[PDB]
Design goal:
The structure is cut from a larger assembly and holds 7 protein chains of 7 kinds. Chain A has helices spanning 2-14, 29-32, 45-90, 92-98; strands at residues 108-111, 127-131. Chain A has 140 residues and is mainly alpha-helical. Classes of the chains: A mainly alpha (140), B mainly beta (49), C mainly alpha (137), D alpha+beta (238), E mainly alpha (60), F little secondary structure (31), G alpha+beta (157). Chains A and G meet through helix 1, helix 3, strand 1 and strand 2 of A and strand 2, strand 3, helix 2, strand 4 and helix 4 of G. Bound molecules: potassium ion. The structure holds 2 RNA strands. Chain B: This is Large ribosomal subunit protein bL27m.
Chain lengths: 140, 49, 137, 238, 60, 31, 157
Amino acid sequence: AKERLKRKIRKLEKATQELIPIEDFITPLKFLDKARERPQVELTFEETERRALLLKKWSLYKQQERKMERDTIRAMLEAQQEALEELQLESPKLHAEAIKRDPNLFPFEKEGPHYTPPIPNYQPPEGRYNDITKVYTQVE
Amino acid sequence: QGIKKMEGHYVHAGNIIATQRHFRWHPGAHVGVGKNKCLYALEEGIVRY
Amino acid sequence: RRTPPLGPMPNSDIDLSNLERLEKYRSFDRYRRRAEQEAQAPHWWRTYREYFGEKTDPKEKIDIGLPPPKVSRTQQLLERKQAIQELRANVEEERAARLRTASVPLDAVRAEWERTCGPYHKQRLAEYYGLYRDLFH
Amino acid sequence: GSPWRLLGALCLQRPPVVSKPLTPLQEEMASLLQQIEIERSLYSDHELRALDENQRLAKKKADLHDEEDEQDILLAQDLEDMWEQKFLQFKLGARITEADEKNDRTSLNRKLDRNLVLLVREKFGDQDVWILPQAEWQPGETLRGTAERTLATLSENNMEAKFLGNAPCGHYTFKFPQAMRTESNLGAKVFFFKALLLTGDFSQAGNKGHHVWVTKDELGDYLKPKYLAQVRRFVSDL
Amino acid sequence: NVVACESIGRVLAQRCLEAGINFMVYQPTPWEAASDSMKRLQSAMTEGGVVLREPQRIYE
Amino acid sequence: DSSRASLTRVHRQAYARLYPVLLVKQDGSTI
Amino acid sequence: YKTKPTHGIGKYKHLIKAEEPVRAINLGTDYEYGVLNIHLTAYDMTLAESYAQYVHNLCNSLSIKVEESYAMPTKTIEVLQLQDQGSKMLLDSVLTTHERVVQISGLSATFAEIFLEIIQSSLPEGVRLSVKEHTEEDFKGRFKARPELEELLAKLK
RNA sequence: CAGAGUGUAGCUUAACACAAAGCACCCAACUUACACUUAGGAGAUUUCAACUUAACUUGACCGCUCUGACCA
RNA sequence: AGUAAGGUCAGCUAAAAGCUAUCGGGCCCAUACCCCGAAAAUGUUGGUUCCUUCCCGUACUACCA
Ligand SMILES: [K+]
């Protein structure tokens, strides 16, 4: 009995494992349904020209933003390297200790800015949370 | 299978320069490749590698 | 039996310890461009151009033409930049280029080609046709 | 020993609290993207419900069959009106705080949309100089350890800071003004470490006006020329 | 631009007519052939008069 | 910052219409 | 040929990594970091995907090896609210949470601060940035469950 | 604040002229994403005087980087 | 020694079933029989989707001087 259970467990371990499907990429049948299809409205020549000009300006703006980000990263890297070189020249031991990795650096969690600051006088209402996530299992 | 005409030899049109199971020599100028990787001369001249 | 290479072997400067780190020819176009450049570069081993490539005298061909004209490069560049800026500022040109309906004046293009690049193209065509080989040896 | 004095400084920065307002170009791009999404999208459940309600109202008006229109009892437009009324009743928070109007550079509540950097005023040679918080390095202690100890040496602050790495992000070297220039003490070399202000602030007693939280643009008002030039190299304003 | 490619094709077709090059070949990659710029250039050359397919060699 | 990748649209070929909505957290902030 | 100076001029497999017909988690050195995972969590799928794409492009431009770019299963949660003057919590709404994961490796100790600062400054609103160390636990959790295996293990117990 | 070195957009010993080039970079479509491809965009000779000619040689004026002064 | 073939619930057979063994009920004064309900496996390895490695046991030959 024990040997048979071990054999079954080994067989199931050898059996391949299936990844959980992603509903973000899976297209539901609601989209396939033709009722949700809407009539299409053509765009005027002026609207198309304005969209093209806006796209060109946006391309230039994104190029400028990328240039600014690259310059900032380069400045940070140069400053850090110069500081490390100065620290090494002044005292090699401190530089050697500083160039080591930080094990406490990567339990990293950060939240982005909110549209509005939290309201001190806000009182959240009473409610309940229910999880209806579809559980996917592999058998046989 | 091997080279039938070494470098500097004189060949005519259609002479089989070489035959190979896999591509060891590739067809060059005025050299054709057969159905079974057979390099033959399309022009009368001198073989060069 | 082994014989050392006469010169530097191909791909002898690519480090193999950083194979993953080195950038790759992700585009067939870049691979083909590099291959063409390498083929154009001379090599000590036997090559196709050695036997089939045309062989010419190493001496430079003696010029027997008129002295070249003199053009103010700075002024020419400034004028061309101003003309291009005016053309791009013209809104009709931008919309025509965006809608793929613009064209060029063939007569003006040919006149400017004759004035600027015409003699050199004619000389190249004459060299291809072999006139200088026969007329002036 | 060494002629230079080892000093470790801390670049305490509060990240922006609210999102930066969009430029007009970004607003136009967002409007275009929303319009494209609406044009290329399919009918939503709400749109289908509204269309079905309109069709059933037309059926009620024209034909005798009514189907009782229980769904049309509460129309989609009526639900939209109720949602709009609820949104109007609800009030959002104020992005611009009283500190922005007061120009009080001691409170963290000002300029929630931009990153802030902390500066402290210390008296050197009977002269008040605004610098980043700093301490003097000690044997058997890392430079990052000194930077962390600067927080402890700060007066009446309850704050949590997250240090990023161990390598300093910048340095500034200066020499004495011939008042105490000596072979033993030629000058000093401060090193800066960037940290993130997760939570906390100073106490009421600590808010005595000796510390200011300022942006990169106004950092030069308090910092010296050379000190500001060195600090701006690693302090970003993206 | 595609207009630039078409203009280059037209100018080159006229120059080839002037030089006597009435036949030639083109060797495009699949993506270049599917590209609209190369299609416009080929159309311009053909309308100018250049044939993009050389006649077969006579062996007898 | 946020504006670097805030301007987005649905990349799915087929997708229902989505309405922009302000979401209010328990502390008073909104997204 | 072997005897000729031009021997082995056509070698190509030495320039190409072995064409193998799961993966050991690399651990960084004293000045390097191991394989890390950046799983951005957001209620907006479009924002999450856009920021994941931005992070991947930034890593490619900064020459940081991106091991993988995938997504975790969407979590669907029903948010309910208690009705006024009643004792029943009606279904207020339904929300979806998405988690776009970028698996990278080879991050330098010195450049780690700069990379984290950039990716936290560029973080969009409503998106939570979470950088952790890649684990076999997470790799297995990416997969489904095996109730038959669970039952057999319980029987073995 | 002074003394040096110093000069094409990001890089190049690209620019003989016929000409300011190649590569790098960004946006749009496909791609989970990356990548490839298709379709679009932005760029520079720091400024003057010297066979006027000269990005190119020679000097000033600028800009950049170090070195000293100043320095908490 | 070299040739062939088998290994299946606890036992024995079959192509994933049957009879007993066993658990839990019923009848019985109580057991046995009987009736009802169940759990109970392809020796094993790696494949292909039937072969094959190893282990256990089985049969035959191992001769002519
Ligand atoms: K052959």
